[PDB]
Design an enzyme around this catalytic site. Structure first.
Site, short mmCIF file in Angstrom:
data_model
loop_
_atom_site.label_atom_id
_atom_site.label_comp_id
_atom_site.label_asym_id
_atom_site.label_seq_id
_atom_site.Cartn_x
_atom_site.Cartn_y
_atom_site.Cartn_z
N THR E 1 0.81 -1.19 0.00
CA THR E 1 0.00 0.00 0.00
C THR E 1 0.84 1.24 0.00
O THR E 1 1.93 1.24 0.53
CB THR E 1 -0.73 -0.01 1.29
OG1 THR E 1 -1.79 -0.94 1.25
CG2 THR E 1 -1.30 1.35 1.56
N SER E 2 0.31 2.30 -0.60
CA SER E 2 0.91 3.66 -0.68
C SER E 2 -0.16 4.67 -0.25
O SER E 2 -1.18 4.77 -0.95
CB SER E 2 1.43 3.97 -2.06
OG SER E 2 2.20 2.89 -2.57
N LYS E 33 -9.20 2.97 0.90
CA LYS E 33 -8.29 3.00 2.08
C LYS E 33 -8.42 4.34 2.81
O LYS E 33 -7.75 4.51 3.84
CB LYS E 33 -6.84 2.77 1.62
CG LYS E 33 -6.57 1.42 0.99
CD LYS E 33 -5.17 1.27 0.46
CE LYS E 33 -5.02 0.04 -0.42
NZ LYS E 33 -3.60 -0.30 -0.64
#
Ligand SMILES: [Cl-]
Ligand SMILES: [Mg+2]
Ligand SMILES: [Mg+2]
Ligand SMILES: [Mg+2]
Ligand SMILES: [Mg+2]
Lengths: 243, 250, 231, 222, 196, 244, 204, 241, 195, 4, 4
Positions: E1-2, E33
């Protein structure tokens, strides 16, 4: 009858006589006041000098909660200490979870719900104290007065104890004569005068004056005791007004 | 603090009476009339909807409650006491039966569980008995249709037909004359409306009368299709309209 | 009358009779005197015997090297409260390497006594205490009452005919407060004070109990031939 | 196991295969992986067979009690919240992977729940050993604004991908269609493309083939 | 994830990729997210999907109950509740959360809460597996008191690189803008951000 | 506190009686009469239903006679609800014993445990005692046919014939008059009905106001059968003896 | 130290025309050592038959537990439990011990007294229900039994034919498993008569 | 007579502690009124600040339970605040457990079930309060549900509570006899508030300044209270008609 | 602990139990009785983990003796074995299970029949004509399969047992210092002093 | 073991 | 276990 023998019992009126009896213990106690001002609150109390043997300045009755809230009470002094101990736990758990110091209205309900809880069961006695408290938060200055029933409101000025009617009459004059507001340093001097005027209802024993204050400008939003020069200046102001 | 009342508030008097159970039954006597009639092919339970105020919406207050798809309950006495008993009765049908046997309890066994809850309020520490008598109508495969009364003591009796509350004495005498063992469900609904008119004083229509049946399976009320064995609930609450239709041919 | 059955009941005038009856147990108790200067604090206690064959009930208890009290009333209740003070004094030492302030000692006793006056089943403590100590702010004398009220004083007295000693100390206040760096003279003033509360009986060798704490003096109790000096 | 969920304009459809396995052995050739939580909320389950069945029945029971208490038709988000809170509490030890779908007063909904208690929202989902075979078909053929008949076709095609290409999945295709303003229709064995061919021989034994030591009548009555 | 949050003149912007992975399989390619714990307090979730959802749901519960009693909570208060859960349950949680909110007094504020459960107030924050690849880029390019369009570009270019280099990051770039004006949701598709 | 409202259910009178036990027994004395008669070849349990209504469902009803296991039954006198709590306990105690020893519980052991539970409510807990008296009719391979009674005190005793509830004084005099040791079941059935017929507060004893049960070895070879009589079977036995 | 294969043993159940059959081996061993050749694995509560394979201490414990539960069921319901209902009771009871399970492979068999329908079901140790029209298998030779049943079985067999099919299924499966055999029992169950036959099989 | 001290039945089947709790309801001497619009539910209550030292902003008997649900109390403030805090806790927990906002009628039932327990359990006293819950429910639309110390609750077309409740009730009854409908047929909440105040003025026979009234309004997806200036604007509208 | 045998014959049950108590490389005792009388007509031999064996035996003995006093009645061997099995069946899912294996030899006075029960530490109960525990079975079971007849006398049973002890003394690796033999019949429990 |  |  017998409705007054047990706490948390409704009389046919719809009254809790045990709470009304606790109020009598409060009415018996020494005079304590609160004055809301421009950017803070001032607390003052009458300390009856029973004997020469009492050490002056060394029987402190005003108590601090967290760093920004002041609490003073009339009636059963130990019951007041028990309530402040609870207040300190409530303010600690609030700061622990939410980071910010507890707002005064939030703090007021924490005491309110606790005192009210002691009117729900016959296995506990109501509190024998009316508590005047407040301080400075993010939304500004707040003064509160809490009663044995759990009843509390916000106040411009508050008074409880044996000289409450005398103090209330003197407080009502300040509210009328200063609609724009009263300054912190003024409120300290007025607090002194009102305790001295309210001492007429308790004049057998001579007394000792104790003052505290929270002010956004004067104390930087923290609770401090008025001592030394500022205390003697307020005493002199009060001495001049009775004569 | 804490519940210091760990002792019985219901005890035997020198005469052998259990005061709080007798007084609970007195509270039921003051309560509005409800009745139940058992037919060959169904059961009917009915009661008056005593409105506290004409501003109040009497539809929101349900005196006749579904306990399981095949069991319904009505009461006389204190409504709040009834409401929490319905909540506990619905839950106990799951926890103590359906979660074990994967099917709903038969009428007699759910009645037995409700009776147990009411008996405990008669003996447990620091509680008064429930101020209600229940009429529980239900069906199950192996017992067929059945009607039970449950009293504050926790005692329960099966009935062909009975009434409880205000005008129960007169209502029971009325039912004795009309009841036979060959009654069809429609005939039992007709008698239920005749019996209830005697005890009701004010308005008598589908908005002031609450009536439910335990009859045939209702596939339309099931909410899904595809499982042949699941044929839908036998409990049905008659609508305000459905009652008024039968009041014209009264 | 109808409102003295337990401590959880207020009277119509707002009184707690069970607390007031506990207060009465102190007045029946034997006299004990407390007084201090700036350097030293002294306890003087008149001990009581059952008869001539019996010992004299010990009135003075040590709490730490710098603190201790004298009792008047139910001795077992004094044992419970003194044991609690010993633990709080001891907790302060082990955790914070800090001698417990005599003022905090008072606040802790107050809050312990209070809980017994608000709860069903329990009873108030039936004893009054005079706590003396020397901490970081000099000499101290406290008066504990089982209502929960704790008071800091120059001098006081509790027990039967305590009013005699309390009046004397109120007169002598200006004299005894300035007995600095002289233990024996401060005790003499305490022994002369308790003498004002005597009737028919006088101070004997196994009758008198004296305790002292000060700047370079740990809390030490004097009984028997050690107090013969002061009669 | 292969389970899918597909959304269309007026509702949601869930499908599943009918194979239960114990290691490499097929325990049940026609088991039901489609569970009714409530009349208009249905659940497809993969993972430990008992865990998916138990968690489905428990929440289904609590949802019925909640529905009776609130006098309201149950909501999918309620079933979803109660399931994910329960699964999280057991830190993945309850091995239930579920596709939760249904219609309620709020509208039509499609969610997935993993054993650890994570939930996902989507227009098309697939779970189980055959999820990658199914998701390949869904990613190839799915579009916005599917009809009912298109969504059933897409869902059953995605299950078939699992049946043929995944060894974990096989036998038949169960479907449940939950359309808004209509009763949910449970289509048990919607497709049966794996019928066993006629055996070459009857293995019916001549009577008396088995050697017997003792006979006795058993008493089942009182 | 970023994931990242950036403060600017008018408030704060939250950005995230849309990819959830089990091993090298992408379980969900359109994950959200960016999750709401209050009207103008949002968070970015990285680590365990199950753990971060459980934490976010509890924080939303705590702030809803806070609002009922004491009115709108500060962004600092929200971060403190996240910290309390993350720190006290550090042994059982894998959750890196960025808390971002808009007060009218305090304007835009960003708090990052790594695995430990420690709290760090920053002008901007980056987290998740893909963040490692853009520390260099983000440090060189970030300026204080940027405009909305500048901040949207900064986040878009940053996550674009994170997605390009990290296998665990991909799909769409979701963003959430928190200003006095209100709450604005933005989405950017591969065909746009890939060829930046 | 709460002390004010405590009845103190578990204390002695100055005479050394348990108030609540005495008042519970007074409660039971108003309940429908229950009779147990033990013969050489079986036991009879008879019980009179409390003033019946004509619209009471008689066939699918159980007020007085309950089954504990395949070998033991009880006749109830007092609060039915109270009895059902104790019966469910007794039914479980029987299955616990079977699970542990792979043998049906001896009658006395089951009776002692149920009696020990009642004793508890008189000595501790501050609760009211159970307003229930039981007649236990059972068989085991040690003592054969056994009749017992238990009462709210938790005291139990064995009997050849016994009554509980209403008019026990009158009932016990009539049983003591006509009972003998070499009696058969069919004779004990007749005695049980004749006793109720005379001690009843009703005008005439009818089938709809009676519950009836026998525990015979009348099954096929060395095994016990419990027979809870159906309405029609009570109607037949009432005509056969010539009461109606 | 694999609980399910210490003692050994097998159960198989089949449906016929208006009849069901359930059969089990008689071996109880301690791994290699054969201890008892009389250990029956099929019990019955009224007209509902339960076979249990796996750890023998749990076979005994569960039999005692279901006897207990069906006895209380009958006293309260005033009727014998039916196979469909008992199946649900077994499932509930096994899943109650989800994180400390009984190491057993139970098999329910019987005819519903109301509908007259033949019913069989199997379970895993955690309580998952495996319902089947044709046959259920359980134990250390479950692979062997699956192979035998899937080939030999045909629908709507008469009681006398069904006896031959289930018997040959068990015998030939047991002879390919070290921990199974040492004698066998077959129950033929009709609506209102039940025949119990002890099979002659090789004793190695 | 200890059957009058705790919640056990009197010989005539009554709970005197419940009856006396009802009398505690009117101890404040304040009258509340609730009515439903098309889109909204309006609740108004009298505001009496007798002491001049009181901060009038802190004197309130209306509470924001959740975003959607508002509650007005008739009874002493300590019991009122006890009931408010519990309702807030219950509404928050409901949203967390079941994933949607607690409906007005379900909260009312929950608080009523709590009230019922105090009437059956001896160690707990009933609260001397009547709780009026108002919202715009996403299923049932504009909703008024009221709870009392008996544990009774029901839905209302409109309702009034306090000493002069009967006068306000008959005033509203007569209006719904005339209008022939279950609600105030009005588009804006501003005019439904004007209706509520107008019909309270007619029933009580008293005039109101801006500081004499306290107003709560429930719309879709929020409940809010009106400031002194919001009410003053509303009082000016009534006067100019 | 190690060797415990049991043979049920026509009119009695015979229990043989090894006398050796070994710890490390030292035989501490050569006269140990690995049996407790539970009731006048019920005897239990035991073998397994040190301490657990006696602690479990004496605990069972106390419970059966308590039942005997309470009911003034001797529990059947079947009843005692069922009680013992359930105690072990509880034990195995405890924090620290009893690692004890037992034989229960009893004479049922009601049936006039000897009964032998073999129960392992898991709670696995079986009624047998002959039983053994540990490695003993691997020799004695095949020997008894051959030589055992169901209608044998007590004297024939003792000769059949001598045959087992001789085979164990020949082929067992460890010195178990002979056996204590006890007979359970209609007249109760007695010990054979010369074996 | 879904991650982000 | 049986898996699906
Ligand atoms: Cl509730
Ligand atoms: Mg990538
Ligand atoms: Mg073999
Ligand atoms: Mg072999
Ligand atoms: Mg009460």
């Amino acid at each position: 009858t017998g409705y007054d023998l047990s706490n948390s019992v409704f009389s046919p009126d719809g009254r809790n006589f045990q709470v009304e009896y606790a109020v009598k213990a409060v009415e018996n106690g020494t005079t304590s006041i609160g004055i809301k001002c421009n950017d803070g609150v001032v607390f003052a109390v009458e300390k009856l000098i029973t004997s020469k043997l009492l050490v002056p300045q060394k029987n402190v009755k005003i108590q601090v909660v967290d760093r920004h809230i002041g609490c003073v009470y009339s009636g059963l002094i130990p019951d007041g200490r028990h309530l402040v101990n609870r207040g300190r736990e409530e303010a600690a758990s609030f700061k622990k979870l939410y980071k910010t110091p507890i707002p005064i209205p939030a703090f007021a309900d924490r005491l309110g719900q606790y005192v009210q809880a002691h009117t729900l069961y016959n296995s506990v006695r109501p509190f024998g104290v009316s508590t005047i408290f407040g301080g400075v938060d993010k939304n500004g200055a707040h003064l509160y007065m809490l009663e044995p029933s759990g009843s509390y409101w916000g106040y411009k000025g508050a008074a409880t104890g044996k000289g409450r009617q005398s103090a209330k009459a003197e407080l009502e004059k300040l509210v009328d004569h200063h609609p724009e507001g009263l300054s912190a340093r003024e409120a300290v001097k007025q607090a002194a005068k009102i305790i001295y005027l309210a001492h007429e209802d308790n004049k057998e024993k001579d007394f000792e004056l104790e003052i505290s204050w929270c002010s956004l400008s004067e104390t930087n939003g923290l609770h401090k005791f008025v001592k030394g020069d500022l205390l003697q200046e307020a005493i002199d102001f009060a001495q001049k007004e009775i004569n | 603090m804490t519940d210091r009342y760990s002792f019985s508030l219901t005890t035997f008097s020198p005469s052998g009476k259990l005061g709080q159970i007798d007084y609970a039954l007195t509270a039921v006597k003051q309560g509005v009339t409800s009745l139940g009639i058992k037919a060959t092919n169904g059961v009917v339970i009915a009661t008056e909807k005593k409105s506290s105020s004409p501003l109040a919406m009497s539809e929101t207050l349900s005196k006749v409650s579904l306990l399981t798809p095949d069991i319904g309950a009505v009461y006389s006495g204190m409504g709040p006491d009834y409401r929490v008993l319905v909540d506990k009765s619905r839950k106990v049908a799951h926890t103590s039966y359906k979660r074990i046997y994967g099917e709903y309890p038969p009428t007699k066994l759910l009645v037995s569980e409700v009776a147990k809850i009411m008996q405990e309020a008669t003996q447990s520490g620091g509680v008064r008995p429930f101020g209600v008598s229940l009429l529980i109508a239900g069906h199950d495969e192996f017992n067929g249709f059945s009607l039970y009364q449950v009293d504050p003591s926790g005692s329960y009796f099966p009935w062909k037909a009975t009434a409880i509350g205000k005008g129960s004495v007169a209502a029971k005498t009325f039912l004795e004359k009309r009841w036979n063992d060959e009654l069809e469900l429609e005939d039992a609904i007709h008698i239920a409306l005749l019996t209830l008119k005697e005890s009701v004083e004010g308005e008598f229509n589908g908005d002031t009368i609450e009536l439910a049946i335990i009859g045939d399976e209702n596939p339309d009320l099931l909410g899904y299709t595809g499982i042949p064995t699941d044929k839908g609930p036998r409990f049905r609450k008659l609508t305000s309209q459905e009652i008024n239709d039968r009041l014209e041919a009264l | 009358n109808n409102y003295d059955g337990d401590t959880v009941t207020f009277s119509p005038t707002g009184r707690l009779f069970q607390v007031e009856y506990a207060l009465e147990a102190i007045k029946q108790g034997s006299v004990t005197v407390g007084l201090r200067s700036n350097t030293h604090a002294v306890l003087v206690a008149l001990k009581r015997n059952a008869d001539e064959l019996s010992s004299y009930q010990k009135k003075i208890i040590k709490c730490d090297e710098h603190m201790g009290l004298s009792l008047a009333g139910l001795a077992p209740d004094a044992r419970v409260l003194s044991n609690y003070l010993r633990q709080q004094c001891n907790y302060s030492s082990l955790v914070f390497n800090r001698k417990l302030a005599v003022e905090r000692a008072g606040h802790l006793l107050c809050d312990k006594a209070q809980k017994n006056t608000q709860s069903y089943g329990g009873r108030p403590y039936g004893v009054g205490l005079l706590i003396i100590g020397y901490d970081k702010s000099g000499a101290h004398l406290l008066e504990f009452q089982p209502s929960g009220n704790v008071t800091e004083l120059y001098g006081t007295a509790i027990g039967a005919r305590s009013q005699g000693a309390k009046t004397y100390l109120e007169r002598t206040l200006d004299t005894f407060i300035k007995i600095d760096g002289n233990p024996d003279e401060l005790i003499k003033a305490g022994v002369e004070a308790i003498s004002q509360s005597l009737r028919d009986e006088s101070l004997t060798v196994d009758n008198l109990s004296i305790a002292i704490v000060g700047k370079d003096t740990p809390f030490t109790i004097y009984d028997g031939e050690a107090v013969a000096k002061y009669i | 196991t292969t389970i899918v969920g597909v959304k269309f304009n007026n509702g949601v459809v869930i499908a599943a295969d009918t194979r239960s396995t114990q290691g490499p052995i097929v325990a049940d050739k026609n088991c039901a992986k489609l569970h009714r939580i409530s009349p208009k909320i249905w659940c497809a389950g993969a993972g430990t067979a008992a865990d998916t069945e138990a968690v489905t029945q428990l929440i289904g029971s609590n949802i019925e009690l909640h529905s009776l208490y609130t006098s309201r038709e149950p909501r999918v988000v309620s079933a979803l919240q109660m399931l994910k809170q329960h699964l999280f509490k057991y830190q993945g030890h309850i091995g239930a992977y579920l596709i939760v779908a249904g219609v309620d007063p709020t509208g039509s909904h499609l969610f997935s729940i993993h054993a650890h208690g994570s939930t996902d929202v989507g227009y098309y989902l697939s779970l189980g050993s055959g999820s990658l075979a199914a998701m390949a078909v869904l990613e190839s053929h799915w579009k916005q604004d599917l009809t009912k008949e298109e969504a059933i076709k897409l869902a059953s095609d995605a299950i078939q991908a699992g049946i043929w290409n995944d060894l974990g999945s096989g036998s038949n295709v169960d479907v449940c269609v939950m359309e808004i303003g209509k009763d949910a229709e449970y289509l048990r064995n919607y497709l049966t493309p794996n019928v066993r061919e006629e055996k070459q021989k009857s293995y019916k034994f001549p009577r008396g083939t088995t050697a017997v030591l003792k006979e006795s009548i058993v008493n089942i009555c009182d | 994830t970023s994931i990242m949050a950036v403060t600017f003149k008018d408030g704060v912007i939250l950005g995230a990729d849309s990819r959830t992975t089990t091993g090298a399989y992408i379980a969900n390619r359109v994950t959200d997210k960016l999750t709401r714990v209050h009207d103008k307090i949002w968070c970015c979730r990285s680590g365990s999907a199950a753990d971060t959802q459980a934490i976010a749901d509890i924080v939303q519960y705590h702030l809803e109950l806070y609002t009922s009693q004491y009115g709108t909570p500060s962004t600092e208060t929200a971060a403190s509740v996240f910290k309390e859960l993350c720190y006290e349950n550090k042994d059982n949680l894998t959750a890196g959360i960025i808390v971002a909110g808009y007060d009218d007094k305090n304007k835009g504020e960003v708090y990052t809460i790594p695995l430990g459960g420690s709290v760090h107030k920053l002008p901007y924050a980056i987290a998740g597996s893909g963040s490692t690849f853009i520390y260099g880029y983000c440090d060189k390019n970030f300026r204080e008191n940027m405009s909305k369009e500048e901040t949207v570009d900064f986040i878009k270019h940053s996550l674009s690189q994170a997605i390009k280099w990290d296998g665990s990051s991909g799909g769409v770039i979701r963003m959430v803008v928190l200003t006095a004006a209100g709450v604005e949701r933005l989405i950017f598709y591969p065909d746009e951000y890939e060829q930046l | 506190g709460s002390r004010r409202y405590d009845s103190r259910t578990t204390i002695f009178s100055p005479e050394g009686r348990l108030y609540q036990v005495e008042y519970a027994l007074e409660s039971i004395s108003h309940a429908g009469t229950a009779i147990g008669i033990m013969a050489s070849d079986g036991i009879v349990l008879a019980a009179e239903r409390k003033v019946t209504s004509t619209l009471l469902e008689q066939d699918t009803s159980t007020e007085k006679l309950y089954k504990l296991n395949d070998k033991i039954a009880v006749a109830v006198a007092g609060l039915t609800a109270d009895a059902e709590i104790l019966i469910n306990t007794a039914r479980i105690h029987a299955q616990n014993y079977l699970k542990t020893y792979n043998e049906d519980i001896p009658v006395e052991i089951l009776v002692r445990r149920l009696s020990d539970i009642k004793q508890g409510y008189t000595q501790h807990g501050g609760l009211r005692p159970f307003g229930v008296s039981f007649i236990y009719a059972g068989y085991d391979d040690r003592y054969g046919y056994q009749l017992y009674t238990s009462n709210p005190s938790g005291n139990y005793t064995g009997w050849k014939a016994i009554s509980v509830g209403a008019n026990t004084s009158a009932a016990q005099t009539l049983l003591q008059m006509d009972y003998k040791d070499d009696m058969k079941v069919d004779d004990a059935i007749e005695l049980a009905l004749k006793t109720l017929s005379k001690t009843t507060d009703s005008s005439a004893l009818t089938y709809d106001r009676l519950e009836f049960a026998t525990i015979r070895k009348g099954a096929n070879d060395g095994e016990v059968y419990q027979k809870i009589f159906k309405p029609q079977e009570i109607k037949d036995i009432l005509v056969k003896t010539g009461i109606t | 130290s694999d609980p399910s294969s210490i003692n050994g043993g097998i159960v198989v159940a089949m449906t016929g025309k208006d009849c069901v059959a359930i059969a089990c081996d008689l071996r109880l061993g301690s791994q290699s050592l054969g201890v008892s050749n009389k250990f029956e694995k099929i019990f019955h509560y009224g007209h509902v038959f339960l076979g249990i394979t796996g750890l023998a201490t749990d076979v005994t414990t569960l039999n005692e537990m279901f006897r207990y539960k069906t006895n209380l069921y009958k006293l309260k319901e005033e009727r014998a439990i039916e196979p469909e209902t008992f199946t649900q009771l077994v499932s509930s009871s096994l899943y109650e011990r989800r994180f400390g399970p009984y190491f057993v492979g139970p098999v329910v068999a019987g005819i519903n007294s109301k509908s007259g329908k033949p019913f069989i079901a199997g379970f895993d140790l955690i309580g998952c229900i495996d319902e089947a029209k044709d046959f259920i298998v359980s134990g250390t030779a479950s692979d062997q039994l699956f192979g035998m049943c899937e080939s030999l079985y045909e629908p709507n067999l008469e009681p006398e034919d069904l006896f031959e099919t289930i018997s040959q299924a068990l015998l030939n499966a047991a002879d390919r498993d070290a921990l199974s055999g040492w004698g066998a029992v077959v129950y033929i169950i009709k609506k209102d008569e039940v025949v119990k036959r002890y099979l002659k099989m090789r004793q190695d | 007579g200890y059957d009058r001290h705790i919640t056990i039945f009197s010989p005539e089947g009554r709970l005197y502690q419940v009856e006396y709790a009802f009398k505690a309801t009117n101890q404040t001497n304040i009258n509340s009124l609730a009515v439903r619009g098309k889109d909204c539910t309006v609740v108004i209550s009298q505001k009496k600040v007798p002491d001049k030292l009181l901060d009038p902003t802190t004197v309130s008997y209306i509470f924001c339970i959740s975003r959607t649900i508002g509650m007005v109390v008739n009874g002493p403030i300590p019991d009122a605040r006890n009931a408010a805090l519990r309702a807030k806790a219950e509404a928050a927990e409901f949203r967390y457990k079941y994933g949607y906002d607690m409906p007005c009628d379900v909260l009312a039932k929950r608080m009523a079930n709590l009230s019922q327990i105090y009437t059956q359990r001896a160690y707990m006293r009933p609260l001397g309060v009547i709780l009026t819950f108002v919202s715009v429910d996403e299923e049932l639309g504009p909703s008024i549900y009221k709870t009392d110390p008996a544990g009774y609750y029901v839905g209302y077309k409109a309702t009034a509570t306090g000493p002069k409740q009967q006068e306000i009730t008959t005033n509203l009854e007569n209006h719904f006899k005339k209008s022939k409908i279950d609600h105030i047929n009005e588009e804006s909440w501003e005019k439904v508030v004007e209706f509520a105040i107008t019909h309270m003025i007619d029933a009580l026979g008293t005039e109101f300044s801006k500081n004499d009234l306290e107003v709560g309004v429930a719309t879709k997806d929020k409940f809010f209270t009106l400031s002194a200036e919001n009410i003053e604007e509303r009082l000016v509208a009534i006067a100019e008609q | 602990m190690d060797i415990i045998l049991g043979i049920r014959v026509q009119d009695s049950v015979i229990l043989a139990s090894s006398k050796a108590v070994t710890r490390g490389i030292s035989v501490l005792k050569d006269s140990d009785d690995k049996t407790r009388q539970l009731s006048p007509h019920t005897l239990m031999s035991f073998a397994g983990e040190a301490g657990d064996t006696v602690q479990f035996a004496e605990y069972i003995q106390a419970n059966i003796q308590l039942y005997s006093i309470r009911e003034d009645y001797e529990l059947s061997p079947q009843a005692v074995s069922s009680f013992v099995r359930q105690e072990l069946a509880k034990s195995i899912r405890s924090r620290r299970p009893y690692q004890v294996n037992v034989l229960i030899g009893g004479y049922d006075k009601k049936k006039n029949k000897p009964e032998l029960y073999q129960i392992d530490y898991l709670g696995t109960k079986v009624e047998l004509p002959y039983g053994a525990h540990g490695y003993s079975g691997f020799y004695t079971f095949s020997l008894l399969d051959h030589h055992y007849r169901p209608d044998m006398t007590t004297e024939e049973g003792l000769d059949l047992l001598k045959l087992c002890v001789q085979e164990l003394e020949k082929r067992m690796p460890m010195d178990f210092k002979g056996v204590i033999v006890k007979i359970v019949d209609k007249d109760g429990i007695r010990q054979v002093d010369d074996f | 073991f879904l991650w982000x």
